[PDB]
């Protein structure tokens, strides 16, 4: 709908990502929570939890907005409850894009080792809820790329449609990319990790660098640079390619 | 085992409470989520959701420590996964005290209006999940009172036992109360809301007041002074009244 409204939604999720990483970092790696199951049909604890959690959310009316995308879509029940009609702001077919399969692999294989200490407390059930909270914030921010794409498309429609007709993802990627905004996002996300992960005490005693921080602010910089922003841009490109259907 | 470790665990919960309130305030009141006639049956959307999410958590191994207390205990299932027996640090019978029904009442009746603006987006499923995270962090904080009661008992067991045998609630309450520390907590919990709720910006010159804070820092002071700290103390008095059984 609005250039500024979409940007505000993204900025606000910077705080939600810092928060969610800080809270999950309260526990160690807790690897038994992710160990796989002996059989098919039996799952790991984290998969069992998410599949069950997403079914409950679906009954409560979740996943009816294009930025709210589940990790396990096939099994999902209908909402049990009355649902307000969609605003319908995006191209419907281009809206069905999902990179959740990639967010999942990224979180467990690459993210978790960066902000989570080696070790094991018994708190597997608490841990997997905190993982789902991380996976959901990441996935909402990344799939807002659908609105980012629409908003850019409507701003320069003749220039974008020319590239869509020629199926030219590489040139679409270049036009989408605002590298100077990306560098601001990374610095601000670093500053947010510094502000929220700080040990707040009533004295304002000096601290040596980020050694006091619950999550290393360079991790937030690195997450955004390597995964969040590249996967959001993947979503815009996939959206834009379908935007003329 | 250590009173400093127990207070360190309660200090870390200060940030979790601020995060959870900030995150729930992303949405407005969304009252139909709590209205029982909005959904079929005598249950509201939030009550339905929490019952289902608690049964899921129980299956994942949750609610196996005395600080982890569910709002709907009567209906909780067994863990699907193996829980390895853990160290018995607390009195078994006195461990079972739960003030969760008072926490639930104060959250929906007293707290929600304070940090949640009037209005309605249809985001009911996100709201009720954000409400449960609030409820879970308040309950854990408050029921860590059990651990507080226990260390305070073991270090002065004889004068504590005599006040238990006499069933003296007011004198147990004056033994437990450290008003100077309560005042640190009220001011620090408020500083954390001010720090974590501000709009963090790449301007070092810029400063903003509590008007820009996502949750009024004074709401956090009030929360602790009115409900969190008294309810934690209700737990440790009711813990001690059973400590000789």
UniProtKB/Swiss-Prot annotation, chains A, B:
Pathway: Metabolic intermediate biosynthesis; prephenate biosynthesis; prephenate from chorismate: step 1/1. GO terms for biological process: amino acid biosynthetic process; aromatic amino acid family biosynthetic process; chorismate metabolic process. It comes from the Eukaryota. Keywords: Amino-acid biosynthesis, Aromatic amino acid biosynthesis, Cytoplasm, Isomerase. One of its GO terms (molecular function) is chorismate mutase activity. Gene3D superfamilies: Chorismate mutase, AroQ class superfamily, eukaryotic. Its EC number is 5.4.99.5. Residues 1-245 form the Chorismate mutase domain. Homodimer. Interacts with Cmu1 of the fungal pathogen Ustilago maydis. This is Chorismate mutase 2, cytosolic.
């Amino acid at each position: 709908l609005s250039l500024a409204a979409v940007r505000d939604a993204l900025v606000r999720l910077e705080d939600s990502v810092v928060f969610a990483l800080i809270e999950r970092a309260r526990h160690p790696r807790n690897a038994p929570a992710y160990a796989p199951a002996a059989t098919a049909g039996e799952h790991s604890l984290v998969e069992f939890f998410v599949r069950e959690a997403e079914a409950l959310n679906a009954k409560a009316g979740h996943y009816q907005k294009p930025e709210d995308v589940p990790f396990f879509p096939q099994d999902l029940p209908s909402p049990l409850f009355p649902t307000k009609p969609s605003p319908k702001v995006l191209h419907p077919f281009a809206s069905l894009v999902t990179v959740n399969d990639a967010i999942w692999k990224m979180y467990f294989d690459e993210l978790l080792p960066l902000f989570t200490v080696d070790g094991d407390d018994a708190s597997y059930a608490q841990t997997v809820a905190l993982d789902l909270a991380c996976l959901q914030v990441l996935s909402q921010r990344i799939h807002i790329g659908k609105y980012v794409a629409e908003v850019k498309f409507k701003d320069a429609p003749q220039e974008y449609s020319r590239l869509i007709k020629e199926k030219d993802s590489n040139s679409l990627m270049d036009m989408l990319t605002f590298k100077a905004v990306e560098e601001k996002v990374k610095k601000r996300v670093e500053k947010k990790a510094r502000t929220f992960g700080q040990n707040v005490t009533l004295d304002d005693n000096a601290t040596a660098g980020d050694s006091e921080c619950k999550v290393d602010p360079k991790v937030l910089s690195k997450l955004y640079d390597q995964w969040v922003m590249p996967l959001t841009k993947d979503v815009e490109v996939e959206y834009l390619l379908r935007r003329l259907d």
